[PDB]
Amino acid sequence: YNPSTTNAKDFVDGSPSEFLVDENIVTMHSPDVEFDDRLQNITNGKFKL
Amino acid sequence: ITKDDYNNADDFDFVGTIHTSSKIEVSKVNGSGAFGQGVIQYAFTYYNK
């Protein structure tokens, strides 16, 4: 949106039930998580991708 | 009688002697293992074969 014209709220109110994709936040799916229950309890694990 | 490095009078007692200042710190790692819920305390003791 152009901030000089409209606010964020007024812009979203034209279609508040619209969805956008997000590749900046992804969802990794490995068999270890589903089958190894030790990886379903990770909490803020410092890892590199 | 097959040892010639007896340097004090406490080396002959039934109970052993500790000369060094053992520094043993225990920290909890999370992610790997299998334990039961509760609190746990670790005890240490030297013993000659």
DSSP B1-49: -------SGGGGSSS----S----------SS----SS-----------
In chain A, alpha helices (H) = 8-12, 31-35
CB B26 within 8 A of CB B42: yes
Minimal C-alpha gap between A26 and chain B (Å)? 23
Chain B residues near residue A41 by CB distance under 8 angstroms? 31
Euclidean distance between CA atoms A38 and B34, whole angstroms: 10
Experimental method: cryo-EM
Q: What is the resolution of this structure in A?
A: 3.4
| Token pair recorded at residue A2 | 């152009």
Euclidean distance between CA atoms B42 and B24, whole angstroms: 10
Nearest-10 Cα torsion for A21, A26, A29, A35: -120
Judged by a CB distance cut-off of 8 A, whether residue B31 touches chain A is yes
Euclidean distance between CA atoms B32 and A36, whole angstroms: 11
